[PDB]
Design a protein around this ligand. Sequence first.
Ligand SMILES: Nc1ncnc2c1ncn2[C@@H]1O[C@H](COP(=O)(O)OP(=O)(O)O)[C@@H](O)[C@H]1O
Ligand SMILES: [Mg+2]
Lengths: 32, 193, 70, 520
Amino acid sequence: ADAKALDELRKPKFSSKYLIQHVSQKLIPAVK
Amino acid sequence: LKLPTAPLQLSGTSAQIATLLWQVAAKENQLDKVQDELYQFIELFKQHSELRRLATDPFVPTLVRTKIISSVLKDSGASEITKKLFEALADEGALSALLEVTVNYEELMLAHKKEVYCTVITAEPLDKLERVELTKKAEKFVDAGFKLVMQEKIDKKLLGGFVIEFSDRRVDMSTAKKVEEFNNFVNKLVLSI
Amino acid sequence: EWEKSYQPPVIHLGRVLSVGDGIARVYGLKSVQAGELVCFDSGVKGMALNLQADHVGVVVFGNDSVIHQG
Amino acid sequence: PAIDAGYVSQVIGPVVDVRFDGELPSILSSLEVEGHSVRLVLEVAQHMGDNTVRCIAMDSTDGLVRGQKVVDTGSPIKVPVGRGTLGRIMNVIGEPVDEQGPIDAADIWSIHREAPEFTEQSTEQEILVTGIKVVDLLAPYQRGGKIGLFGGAGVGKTVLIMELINNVAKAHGGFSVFAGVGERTREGNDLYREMIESGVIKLGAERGNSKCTLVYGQMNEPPGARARVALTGLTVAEYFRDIEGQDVLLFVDNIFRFTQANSEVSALLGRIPSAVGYQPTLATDLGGLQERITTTTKGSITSVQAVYVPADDLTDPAPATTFAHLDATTVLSRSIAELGIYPAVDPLDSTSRMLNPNVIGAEHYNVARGVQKVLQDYKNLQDIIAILGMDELSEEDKLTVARARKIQRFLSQPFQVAEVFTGTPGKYVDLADTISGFQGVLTGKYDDLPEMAFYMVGDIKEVKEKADKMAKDIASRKEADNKKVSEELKDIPSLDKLVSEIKEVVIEEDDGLEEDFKAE
Ligand SMILES: Nc1ncnc2c1ncn2[C@@H]1O[C@H](COP(=O)(O)OP(=O)(O)O)[C@@H](O)[C@H]1O
Ligand SMILES: [Mg+2]
């Protein structure tokens, strides 16, 4: 699925950062 | 060949990917690792524009999208499950289905973690004897041995009491609806008696 | 006697996805029966006609101009 | 019991989807629903591809929740067949609905089976005399063939099939099976009482001496049940043909209801519709039924299948597909039923493969072809009689008009079962007598007889007898009408003496409706 269980992903809920930290520096030469 | 059964059945074509993902990560017992990885990918889609351009643009070729999702997910300790999932979902342009495959995966894991949510909405901040007496009356609405959590919201429209929001059933034990059903019960008798 | 016998019952509710052309695509209602008389919040009744896998089709016994999404 | 216990996924009317975790059933197999009010039997029609079958429900789906467990039987819908079913009424799943205990079952046969092959077919042509004049004259019924009674909505194809039951089904020697596919429930109760009163159905412990098995899925049943009751009647008849090895009868009422039930189901399976609104698989479903009703080498099934036409339309595809599967066709028309003719057999559209000069004789064949020729030359002149009148025709044409008006009235016949509402007693005509009668009217031996003497009489004696009766009563006259009504000696009492004889009923205080509503 509904909208009520899909709006609640707009708030951050990872509780770990081992993916969004490293690949944020890799993505820009990958699209370059 | 031998896949463990999902705790609750679900819908098609986006919930089936979540069913297969829960089955595979339950064969590997990484059921909370890949949930964290999918949450990280949701926020990663939120952060940058060159990644959501891989899911909303229809003029990106599938070769560069497959090679970008492989060469990005080569490293950083990513699971084999999430890597092969994103490879298969980027080969077919199904990266926009991430936001509604992870919700069905969360419903599946919430069925497994044996934990059901609720939300009690009130008028005053609850005190500790109000709360421990609330849990005994709200547990009688669950149907097995679960871990029903109790969320708190405050809304001044109720004149005391509590309303339980289970996201599928609603128990209105409030006084504002008690007096609302009271004034409806009188006026059906004054017109008659 | 109405207060000493007053238990507010648990009610399984569901949202409305879309309304138009004499149907109400109702989200949820996992415990509804095919042909069960459902009752909207505006008072107008309905019948759970098409129990689909992802919603419940509800025809509206009355004017559907009082029914919104949500 | 985690595996082999599926749950209901979705419900669209009479179409139920079951989703399994493993070992989906084969198509055309029967499922059982756990915790339903009646025993609701599903039947798998498709595989939807997400571990999901798409079932047709043999009862109502009102009250199905999308969490109900559904077990598998691992078999199709299997009905109790044997000699013990003789005298029982069965629904589409083989239960007795006549309340006489369970069915004494020799074997339990499924309703889905392959048709008998090409080498098992029999090629035999012997006549079946029915006593009706139009059937035994213009389209003689094959003994062991297929018979379709077309025509729709009040032309008399359900009266005609009761007349065929009453004529052939008692002088046959073999068994009979009546399969009521979507006709009235009242008609099934009428046939049940009329077969108990006639002795082809017996009750008690002497049930086995009966000669008729009833299978009813009548028109109150949901479209899952009406699509399968013809197959159940076929399984009951095919046990007698295939295992008992003896010749039966199989009167299927309203075989259009089979095609219509499959069209009501196939609207909700999401298939693209064919011509005027039917399913795409009309011809194959009707072939897979109708090719099972065949006479093999070991036995015979002589079927009389009433075929309802929609809105009197023979170019509708549901009867026009059925026209190819029938040996002898008996088309009924409403334009002849509005002329008072009964049975309203259309003589220039009802054909048979038995009408051949090598089989039934050149005398019967030439009489039938002459009758068809006279009626067709009459039908060519109908507009000329309409606008220009009878007073300008040729001599030969206004002789063929009189001969055709005599044979149209002569083809009508009072029925042995229709006298409940018409008064005229029914006349069972022999074959050679009606052949000789139509030979006489074709040659012209009865030109000077009145036309209404031919109406509603059995054979060539009774037309001259009705001419003598109806041409007495135009010249019959009595003088003073011989009343002797007044002054009857100790016969008529007074009016108040007859009033005092009447017992008086009491009036029980204004409908008593509250006393027998607070009782429950
Ligand atoms: N041989 C007949 N003689 C007189 N009336 C008939 C005859 N056959 C049929 N009818 C009339 O047709 C009516 C019923 O037709 P029916 O057999 O029910 O056709 P259908 O089943 O298509 O409606 C009866 O009320 C009856 O009056
Ligand atoms: Mg009828």
